[PDB]
Amino acid sequence: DRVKKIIELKRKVCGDSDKGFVVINQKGIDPFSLDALSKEGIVALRRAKRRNMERLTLACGGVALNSFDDLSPDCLGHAGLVYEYTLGEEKFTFIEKCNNPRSVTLLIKGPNKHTLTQIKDAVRDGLRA
Amino acid sequence: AFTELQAKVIDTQQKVKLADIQIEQLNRTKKHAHLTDTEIMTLVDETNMYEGVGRMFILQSKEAIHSQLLEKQKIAEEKIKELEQKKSYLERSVKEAEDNIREMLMA
Amino acid sequence: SAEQVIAGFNRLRQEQRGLASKAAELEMELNEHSLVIDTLKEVDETRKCYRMVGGVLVERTVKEVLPALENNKEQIQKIIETLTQQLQAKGKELNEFREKHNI
Amino acid sequence: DQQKINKFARNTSRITELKEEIEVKKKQLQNLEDACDDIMLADDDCLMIPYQIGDVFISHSQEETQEMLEEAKKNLQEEIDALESRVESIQRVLADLKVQLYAK
Amino acid sequence: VEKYQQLQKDLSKSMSGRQKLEAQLTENNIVKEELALLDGSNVVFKLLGPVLVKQELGEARATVGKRLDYITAEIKRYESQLRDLERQSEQQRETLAQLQQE
Amino acid sequence: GGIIEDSCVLRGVMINKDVTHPRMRRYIKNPRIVLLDSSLEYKKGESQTDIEITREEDFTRILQMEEEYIQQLCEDIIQLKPDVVITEKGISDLAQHYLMRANITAIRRVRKTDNNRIARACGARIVS
Amino acid sequence: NLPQLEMLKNQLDQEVEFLSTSIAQLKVVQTKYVEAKDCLNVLNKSNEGKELLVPLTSSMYVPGKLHDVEHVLIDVGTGYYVEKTAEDAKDFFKRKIDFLTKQMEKIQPALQEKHAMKQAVMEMMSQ
Amino acid sequence: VLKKLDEQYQKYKFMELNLAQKKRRLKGQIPEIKQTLEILKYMQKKKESTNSMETRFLLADNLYCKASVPPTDKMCLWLGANVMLEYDIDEAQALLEKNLSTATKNLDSLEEDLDFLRDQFTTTEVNMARVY
Amino acid sequence: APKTDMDNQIVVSDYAQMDRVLREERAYILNLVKQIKKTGCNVLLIQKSILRDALSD
């Protein structure tokens, strides 16, 4: 049921494959669905963090459902550019130039130590100053 | 104090739950007494017809049994009025009093 | 948030127990329709058949008892499939309304 | 793995089920027997003696009224002798399953 | 400890047959209300098993009067049975609990 | 809500403790306040206290005398022409909604120290 | 406080259901008392002579003819034969109907007492 | 080791309850068919027991009306599910005797086989546990 | 009667089994009482019913 609802939504929003459509799922997606959605012109990100779930609604947009019903682009948000970046054992998809660039993400790199924690509150107090 | 007036309308809620289930029986007993009257008004072949309350089934002619079975649906028709008026009355008693309870405790 | 997902799955499971009482209640009756229609055809039907349930005996024949036997058996097996589809459709409906509310 | 203790577990449970069947048939035996003596003592053949067969009734002599209960006591007691003939047969294997653990 | 439940089961088994008597106790009082109205208007029989034996009204009054008295005889022994089994087991709940500890 | 400075003292004794809602009216210029510690418990029988309504047979006979006790009280209250009646002791659910039929919105669930202030808000004696 | 109340509210739930089942049993007892009066209402009115199908045993019916409608058996006592007329039989049925109602009436506020106490434990754990 | 013994204790006890659901339904069939034979075989008919007898009809559970019996010679047995057929003695007798003999053997042949179906369930769950 | 748990050792759930055995308990105490007065007695010394198992009133 949920596989067939993705197909009607892509033709509802885009109408073509020249205009993209991005699904950020907070849960994992079937890989046979990730094969079938890839041919339709859809990228479908999975296992998304629940902290990212509210902030993407604020700047980009997009509300939560348990269906993929036919929705206009007014009900969804927009991003200007989506790029999947890779560093480490996980892929880290960059999503920039929002519908409203209201939140700016400060992406630090680090050895994933307390040094990464020590540079976290340092730039935090850097922003508060 | 204010604890006692809370428990009165809560005890009134369970009386509505008793009032809600009585109308489900009396609507069923009207239609079922109507349903058995239809099956005996269906046949024209035989005036033989058995009625009973226990496991006894007395031999009578069917025509006098119809008019009694006309009265069987009718008493169950009479009771759904007095219960639904009662069920609405107990509903109006608790819900309008429930408007008094929560808004003045939260005040 | 993940609490709207894990609690909505508890809501669909409780309707599976609400599905549970109604379909099996009819399902016990169709096997009684199974055992009755076989004994009637084996026994003599030239003498007149009646319909005896609790509280009423209407004096009948075999030709009026026989079709309702095959009718009431077929009506039960349709509803136990029908009661399954409706309550499982209800579990799908409450999940999407919980996700569109607290977002 | 032992198959003789598989027979030993089945043997003791068959001891239990037999003795319980004797006790319930003894209480039914005295129930019919004491039902005979009470109804004879009160009011023998005066005009008629009604006897219950379901919800219809038969009127006859006082001793024939016992006679239906006398037959069921005869059928029940022959079972009690046959039950104890199976209680005895379940004890002989119990003395022999101890050696069969050492034999095989 | 098996001695805890054993005194309770011997008490509770006696209570179940005693509660059987109390509905019989009330209906023994119901029939005495009905035997008082009869003085020859309707005779009575006795339902005893598969045989329904003729009675008289004075025979009926003594019959339910005896069975009223046999119930009360089994009531009073249970009051002895209640207090004895609850006090013996109460002594056992202290001593037999210490047996499993050490 | 609001701010301190554009407020001022008002007459009577102002109430904030339970009544925070327009259950009385929206506004009142002329009609009076009614304080009821009087007996508003309805009559179950003819003038008797039988069982209350829990039966259809108890529904038809008793309810005619249930409103009959209330409408006698309501006619006594309309003599002074209120639009607001608050009732504290003896208040029934039917009694405060025949007043809704008697065009007076009726109030309960208030503590006694409120209705000492409300009696001092108008300077009147609470009727028994 | 709270661990005692969580054990306390679960005990009262059984005590409601144990009493409410006893209410459900006694309604079945007064059900046949209503049922026996309504069988008796047809008996005097119809006449003697009419044919009845009564249970010879379970699920087996014997025919018969009807006689002496004004003399009936009432089963009271410990299972004892009491012959009455049909007129006094209706009075004793309705007396047993109010009796079984009286047996449930003594349980009924105590049935509601176990329910209201359990709800108060739910409130005291909430408060 | 007692650790392997302890897992087989709980898996044996839980499978006892699934057997008792099936035996009691087999138990509930037996007295109902038992009442059919013994009441019929003692009265045997109005016809076979030699005309007019006595009766006190079952109108209810406490209300029995005394009358004279004499019916015509038939028995309208009850099949169930909107079915009554009129029967005679010979049709009603040999049917219920067959239902009498099976209902004991339905209780007897299953209660051994249920005791080993429990033993299948307890044995199956422990061998997969010790391997993986 | 003898007593192990009950003074009247019945498994009682029935009216006939409590009637048949308890009328017989009245039977033998009918005959022992008659032997008291025929031998000539006017004052009788009875100890406690805990000094026995039961005394039938």
Side-chain angles (χ1 to χ4, degrees), chain C residues 33-51:
Chain C
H33 289 290
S34 300
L35 295 173
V36 166
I37 64 182
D38 294 331
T39 58
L40 183 63
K41 298 297 290 182
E42 292 177 352
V43 79
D44 194 6
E45 291 183 355
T46 61
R47 67 266 185 98
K48 59 199 289 181
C49 296
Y50 300 150
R51 54 178 299 274

Side-chain angles (χ1 to χ4, degrees), chain B residues 3 6 10-11 14-15 50-60 68, chain G residues 35 38-39 42 46 50-55 59 61 66 112 115-116 123:
Chain B
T3 306
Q6 295 175 0
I10 294 171
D11 292 330
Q14 65 182 357
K15 290 189 285 291
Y50 289 179
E51 67 183 4
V53 181
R55 295 174 69 93
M56 53 86 73
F57 292 97
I58 193 165
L59 171 60
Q60 295 183 358
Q68 295 176 357
Chain G
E35 182 179 1
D38 294 331
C39 292
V42 188
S46 297
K50 285 175 173 177
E51 187 178 2
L52 281 76
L53 289 176
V54 299
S59 299
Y61 291 165
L66 183 59
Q112 293 179 356
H115 185 272
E123 292 180 354

Side-chain angles (χ1 to χ4, degrees), chain G residues 15-51:
Chain G
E15 297 181 356
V16 173
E17 295 294 326
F18 292 158
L19 292 174
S20 178
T21 307
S22 67
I23 301 304
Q25 294 175 357
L26 299 178
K27 293 191 266 79
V28 181
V29 181
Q30 69 186 3
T31 301
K32 65 182 182 292
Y33 292 153
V34 178
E35 182 179 1
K37 183 185 262 79
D38 294 331
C39 292
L40 190 61
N41 290 318
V42 188
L43 185 64
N44 295 321
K45 289 180 184 178
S46 297
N47 51 6
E48 300 176 358
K50 285 175 173 177
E51 187 178 2

Side-chain angles (χ1 to χ4, degrees), chain D residues 14-15 17-20 22 80-92:
Chain D
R14 288 176 291 172
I15 301 171
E17 63 183 1
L18 288 171
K19 297 185 287 184
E20 296 176 353
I22 302 174
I80 296 169
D81 307 336
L83 260 55
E84 294 180 355
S85 298
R86 183 65 181 87
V87 174
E88 68 185 2
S89 297
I90 204 58
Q91 295 294 322
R92 292 182 289 112

Side-chain angles (χ1 to χ4, degrees), chain E residues 18-42:
Chain E
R18 184 175 180 270
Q19 293 174 358
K20 195 273 303 179
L21 299 173
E22 297 295 325
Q24 285 174 346
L25 187 148
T26 58
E27 291 175 350
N28 283 317
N29 293 319
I30 291 176
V31 62
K32 291 179 178 67
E33 295 174 354
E34 299 184 356
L35 290 174
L37 295 175
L38 295 175
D39 54 350
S41 298
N42 296 115

Side-chain angles (χ1 to χ4, degrees), chain A residues 1 50 53 64-67, chain C residues 1-2 92 95-96 99-100:
Chain A
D1 195 3
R50 299 290 184 178
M53 190 178 182
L65 279 79
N66 209 167
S67 297
Chain C
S1 178
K92 293 183 182 181
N95 291 318
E96 65 181 1
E99 296 296 326
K100 291 189 285 186

